[PDB]
């Protein structure tokens, strides 16, 4: 079922092999339950979101009640969250830019050019 | 100039900018900010292309600004997805801190952190 959980998240096989190298996914039954499919997401997104693989594996060490790779992790959250705090400021400000960009467009009176479905994307 | 340009963040990279049209042909505050803000849209996941897009407005070039509604659109949806994303992953990460005991210690509160 590899094939299919690599298009169900979704990542190339190879990425999954490597995954499963690396340690971030457990090893299936003789195969790759939902909860790999989660793991695989969680991977995923947050790789996607400007995290390393390294800060990936030791939170999926709580996750896995490994002690080792759990250690100092008060340091570890506190500095990821100065981080993503302002990552998050930087992206609302710009955010706001983007709006008041978008208001000054003559479209944006127009009710047949609003947004619809790509509210739900 | 290009020497006290340079810390901001190098010297090749400012005549890459240049060559691509992102920067004016160097000195000036402006062009500080506007390297600053260059550097920093690259560091939360803008392409080039949609920075330069962006740089559009600035320069009042019309060619580069048309279909800059349906652009807006686009980017705003991505970043809301990625502004919801990280304020649940920052409370989490909140959540694990406060699951530490050094979250009940005093010496231990983050003060520098949060400036820094």
Not at 34 to 58: A, S
Not at 83 to 94: A, G, S
Request: hydrophobic share 35%.
């Amino acid at each position: 079922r590899i094939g299919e959980l690599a298009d169900k998240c979704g990542v190339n096989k190879e990425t999954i092999r490597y995954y499963e190298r690396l340690g971030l996914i457990p090893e299936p039954e003789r195969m790759y339950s939902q909860q790999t499919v989660d793991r695989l997401h969680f991977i995923k997104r947050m790789q996607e979101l400007g995290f390393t693989l390294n800060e990936i594996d030791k939170l999926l060490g709580v996750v896995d009640r490994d002690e080792a790779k759990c250690r100092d992790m008060y340091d570890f959250t506190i500095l990821k969250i100065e981080d993503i705090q302002r990552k998050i400021e930087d992206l609302k400000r710009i955010e706001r830019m983007l709006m008041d960009l978008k208001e000054r467009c003559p479209e944006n009176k127009d009710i047949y050019e609003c947004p619809i479905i790509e509210t739900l994307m």
